[PDB]
């Protein structure tokens, strides 16, 4: 004995001869047939199927009633009555696509309600307790299958203990912030399946840079934490919304116990919702479960990988689609990167890239002295190249530091022990060791002994390790080439653009003439032979030449040039710190002038060395550097939670802005016959730049 | 005597020597100065300014305290205490950017609560009544300055009376639907300022095409309406959310009474919010106040304009930005057009265009007989051109109607009177009269006497009337030209594309060869001399030629051709009803084959007649038609609420698909020497098409 009805969220309207309409606030349906008009009056829940046959005795034979009833179940218009529920309520659950008969049993299980901070008044729990009772849910004192945790802040310290309890009890729990101008629901944490609270917290702490900083400064000071807007109406909204959601999750829980994957409607599982009361904005923030989560995952993950050998494969060459792939990382709570991003998928990769570099604590390392590590170790000076002068004058020079670059660090104390991170030598196929402080952003030093500032030179991302490695390697040769030129102020040959098989170069050049601008490309290729170029554009008239520079390096010189022009273009577009743009002149800047005593570079002056494989090109690159007497090192910074590959390529010896130690910077010009004698440190280009 | 405090939504953290941080959940701020650290301990609301001077007597001179206090007011960090409020509550209002001291006075005014339908249980009012009391608001039996109206449907008939009451009482009222799976707040209607409920309703009825239709069918049947999902938790959410919002509006109301435009935070005024409980989606829907609203506006607006003469100006020639301009029209409730739209700003204009055509009831017209109107009237047959055969066989032909086109209407009964709409004759500068049924979509006929079906031929939109008029005129000549060709199956000369000064034509042509396709353009120009073309692409190999056709007409033949190729391209892209694509062949379709007995059309065969002015071009067009013996009529369908110009250009005599009455269709071929004798009706191209 079990009555049947057209789902209670439909208003049935029968238009006699042959029409029936099912009207619902989130969807309508029509049925066509004289049979439907004759049966549906009895599908109001007041009749069991045995009993519908009685009423249509002379009208419709049983067998056709059965068939029509089966049609309606298959079409999802028919459900078993739920006597123990309002139609109002039954309708809600049926509007969700669920047998309301099932619901009473799903909700009869108990739920417990608790607080995390000290910032939740006693009555607020009682309030929620009431709403849940009114929704048909058992509540008890902390057996329970859901623990609801009311807090005023998701970084409340107490949650760490609570998270552990729930992990070791395998017990779902739900966070709710009902106080404040923005209401937060979830995540509903489910120990086998979702992230833990610590998955959330290492991300959220990353989006409270300030609040962390104040706390630190407050603790330093010590012995020698928040406020909250709340109308009763907003409080009550949040609690009531939560009750709705808890209900939904318990019904889902139930259906799925019975039939795994049967219930598809959305719940708070692994999700946060924020409802802003001042700006009426609703937003979803998805919690990712972090594979390397120290609490609920494998902390040693990166430690392990760092000491395993690097594994590179073939990568033949067979968008804004990227932004979808890494969408779940864009956000103020749940995300690692914020805003819209920073086409823009370029600034997204770079933001994600920079984040990956930030030292979390799990990174591979060994505490040892330089001596202990022996030849596998690399002295940081082999990568920084600050002159002895720079260091000794570091104090006076540092006070005035024009730029973030011109911070001279402190000298490395080799005699002391340090964290050393393993990095893969492609050139020698072994690990070597670089100090961890050079390898990751924000490595925590002892205060005084800051021996470096991490820098992003050689850092790079890609959808594969090999794409990233070539990116980072070319970023390196671009800056080593620009440094050799800029600082030695070297007169360089220009490039016949027509000779290249790219109609765009000459076209863009010409276009600049209509916009009151000249444009040459100088050749910055140095002893690696890898094509490197500057684009020099100056204004034609006006009282300031406004010289804009743009760089590029690639195996294919055409690619390299295109990048240089693109950079000039992006800068040029922005314009309309320093005073280069006001003061610099070709007339007073010989190194910006093409060497007339040397012929123009054509397409034919660049021996081709790039191939269909990116692996091949990496290894081409490595060999080239070995030819120069340089070891190509790589460090994978990729994070399992993020997915996008991030590397730091390191080629010790290769030169970066603002560092004047002995090395290539002086020797290469001479070795290449740009000079009889090396230049002196005091004669290095004192103009600050480029860009 | 009136105490001062740092706004209660900030958590003040003083870091002794020189730092102070104001921490708030929607924004942080830092202050720098030893003075701030010394004064801010006393800006906790416990001290009047007279009293802060006492405490810092020996420390800080009065004058500097005053200055610092003035700084903090100017910077918006300081507010007068509100004794009669929680800090919790004060904080909410300060997080909104408002003196909490002001708030108590704003809320002390009374508000009344009521129902619209029969579908709001008694306790629901009491529920909301309670929430408002708890929020500090007076509630009374229906003096009041806000009437809150709980309903289960926004098209509830009772609202019309309520809307009138409020209009004649100049009394704000707020609609709320707290029942159902989706909660609706607002609009808050404000009689001088917002739309009325009828502004909302003519739009909303437009988005319930079905629900209207069921109601109609139900009433026809008569004497010979909805359901609603509701958990207590969802009900309570909506009521509580509303209380929040009502509060906000009353405080805004208050501040602005005192200082017009002082309060800038958002309220429900002229807005609907929907909060979906099943999919957790929050959406805003803005109510537009309709200038021609019969209830709160000027009904006679269009009536008036229709009989005033058309006013066209100069329009010299000096994007997806359009989609922003008409964004407020895209939506299921408030909007006229739905979905995303239908680049896409093309399908938006067309959707808005079609909507404007729909007969509302306000359109200009005169009830008269053909005879009464005399020569100013135009017989619909002069615009439809159905053959006598078509009409007499209308019954047999109609049963099987292949297409929406092949509905043969009924003959016009001239002897009877009809609604006649005035239309502007550009050619004669007077109004003429066309039956209203031809002029607007969905004109309500008496059932039997349906003498036409409205059609969109000559309909067109633009950001100015003149752009729309040229669009609609060219759409007309495109279809008159294609009809003459198609139906008479006329062999036509091809077009030398190289001869045109457009490198793209030859390039696209070539591209089609790589995609297994040929492509010619035939010249469809007829006796108007206005350039009109078909693009004919056929597959090269495969067992079905899959011939795709694309049309174009413009004064500039290059523009016209470009349109033809673009159309071919859009169709071609879609492919990968009828069986043309399977069965049609060049071999069996002479009219698709270029006439070899006639030379190829070059750029030089098209006398240039377009100019810098669009007005000039309209009038060029009109003159050309007058030369052909044709009156150019225009009817502005633009709606004041929508803004985008929409016209219908009518040129009686010019031919449309599927209509075989005596006229141009037979006479033009002969007049142009394409035939010695006119073709017979039975010999008209019987293949159905084109597209
Ligand atoms: Zn975890
Ligand atoms: Zn109105």
Author numbering:
A (entry chain A), B (entry chain A): 3 to 144, 156 to 237, 250 to 343, 355 to 378, 423 to 656, 667 to 781
What does the paper say about this structure?
The cyanobacterium Prochloron spp. produces multiple macrocyclic cyanobactins, which are known as the trunkamides (seven or eight residues) and the patellamides (eight residues). These natural products originate from two different ribosomal precursor peptides (denoted TruE and PatE), and each ribosomal peptide contains multiple distinct core peptides. Heterocyclization of the multiple cysteine residues in TruE is carried out by the single enzyme, TruD, which by definition is processive. We show by biochemical assay that TruD is an adenylase, not a kinase, and that TruD processes cysteines in a defined order, which we describe. We have shown that the leader sequence (crucially residues 26–37) is required for processivity (heterocyclization of subsequent cysteines).
Domains 1 and 2 of TruD share 21 % sequence identity and structural fold with the enzyme MccB, an adenylase found in the microcin C7 antibiotic production pathway (MccB catalyzes two successive adenylation reactions). Pairwise superposition of TruD with the MccB structure gives a Cα rmsd of 5.4 Å over 219 structurally equivalent residues (MccB lacks the third domain); individual domain superpositions are much lower due to a domain rotation (2.6 Å over 80 residues and 2.0 Å over 152 residues). TruD and MccB possess a similar dimeric arrangement and both share two CXXC motifs in domain 2 that bind a Zn2+ ligated in a tetrahedral arrangement of sulfur atoms. Both motifs are conserved in cyanobactin heterocyclases and these motifs (and associated zinc) are a conserved feature of one class of adenylating enzymes. The coordinatively saturated zinc plays a structural role only12b, in this class of adenylating enzymes. Domain 2 of TruD shares the fold of this class of adenylating enzymes; other members include human ubiquitin-activating enzyme 5 (1.9 Å rmsd over 134 Cαs) and thiamine pyrophosphate biosynthetic enzyme ThiF (2.1 Å over 142 Cαs). There is, however, a subtle topology difference; all the adenylating enzymes that share a fold with TruD have an insertion between the first and second strand of the central β-sheet relative to TruD domain 2. Significantly this means that the ATP binding site of MccB is not fully conserved in TruD. Domain 3 of TruD is a novel fold and has a large negatively charged central cleft. Structural data of course do not establish the mechanism but they are entirely consistent with TruD being an adenylase enzyme.
